[PDB]
């Protein structure tokens, strides 16, 4: 193989492969894209019980990386004029008109600043009807727009509004509009029967196979499944949006604009944004308990960093998804697994690889 193939294989073997034994992870896919060249490394098993090895067709759960597709869908709708980020949700979900949540705008929902939405819905909110009742009954707490609290309900409501503005269900927004515009072939909200043999099982801490059961309004927060080649195409689109037709190009660019700052992290749509180079500590700090689990006051931005990079983790207690890209270096990395790996390990391994790859 090419010298670049061998160099990148060695770096991934050195930095990602040891995580498999350390965390007893059945399967992993790691990809690098550099200058429109893709490098794919597959390890282990998609299904332990079937002894099916991970391969280029293996579909993994993206978990919280799904929010990047919700963000792209929102950027797409905004740039088609179907929504404005200054709108409020009751303009689209009419049952929310004349309720307190209709005082929060769509950008605030997308970027977690409503001031009273936690990581998850309350346990008793289990059905679509109950989600609507929850939002009708909601009242504000913190000054709207001033505090970031990472929140699945918040971006879930944003995704629902995006779908309503496009006159189709959220799963169809992604599967019929967004995924095709990004050139993705095996990315799904609902995996079809003809692809179930490619759909990796997840594994809990007892190494038992588990298959996600959907939660209400879950798809925009954590409901996307994809392959390594598709995720490398997605990173390519984020690195080279100018090469794509206007509607999706504008959508991608919309997700790259920082909207406010918390310490050294800038919150874009879905993506977290940093000045490049970001120190390893800066990247780790973005994943701290303080940032992920607690409210943090935001600061308006005067201007975005001059040179930028972006990342997004899955949940640290779910599996092992992580994506990162650096526009100036025309490079990005994707990691997918079917077993929990701490987010700090994902960030550290990707940092080592991207810092070592030759130009």
Author numbering: 3 to 361
Provide the authors' own sentences about this structure as they appear in the paper.
ADC-68 is a representative of a group of intrinsic chromosomally encoded class C Acinetobacter-derived cephalosporinases (ADCs), with more than 350 variants currently reported. These enzymes can produce resistance to penicillins, narrow- and expanded-spectrum cephalosporins, and monobactams. In this study, we selected a triple mutant of the intrinsic class C Acinetobacter-derived cephalosporinase ADC-1 (ADC-1TM) that confers high-level resistance to the carbapenems meropenem, ertapenem, and doripenem.
The Ω-loop in monomer A of both enzymes adopts a β-hairpin-like conformation; however, the B8–B9 loop shows a large variation in conformation. In ADC-1, this loop bends outward from the active site, whereas in ADC-1TM, it folds markedly more inward. In monomer B of both structures, the B8–B9 loops adopt a similar conformation (different from that in monomer A) but are ~1.4 Å apart. This difference in location is a result of the Phe322Ser substitution in ADC-1TM, where the smaller serine side chain leads to rearrangement of the main chain of Arg321, whose side chain now projects in the opposite direction and forms hydrogen bonds with Asn204 and Gln207 of the Ω-loop. The proximity of the B8–B9 loop and the Ω-loop to the catalytic serine (Ser64) and the active site suggests that any conformational variations of these loops may affect substrate binding and/or catalysis.
